[PDB]
Design a binder for this molecule. Sequence first.
Ligand SMILES: CCCCCCCCCCCCCCCC(=O)O
Ligand SMILES: [Cl-]
Length: 116
Amino acid sequence: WVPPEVFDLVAEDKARCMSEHGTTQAQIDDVDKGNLVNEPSITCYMYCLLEAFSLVDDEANVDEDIMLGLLPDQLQERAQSVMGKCLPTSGSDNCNKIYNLAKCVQESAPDVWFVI
Ligand SMILES: CCCCCCCCCCCCCCCC(=O)O
Ligand SMILES: [Cl-]
């Protein structure tokens, strides 16, 4: 469902986030396929990229309105349903909060789940 335009929009932040955190594309592909581990090089990548687009703040609180703003209408209240379950975020730090959120969302909605 993700438009191709999104890929060029995120390219610059994706490069920076991967470089900052030691992330490999293979780690991203693995999360993308539903396999999540609590490794900072991928969890901090996910936090990094969300933050770059104002989807989370300095304590990994999710901005639900901006998030709903970005999704298409067909997912718009599946997402509200998933956010009801999975928010607020909780964890030992920003990266771990996003790990637990990722775990929750992908379990709650696997056929829509993805990470760029
Ligand atoms: C759903 C929370 C779990 C963790 C999410 C994984 C990180 C992927 C972040 C996607 C960033 C997309 C921002 C692009 C918005 C746009 O410019 O159109
Ligand atoms: Cl939250």
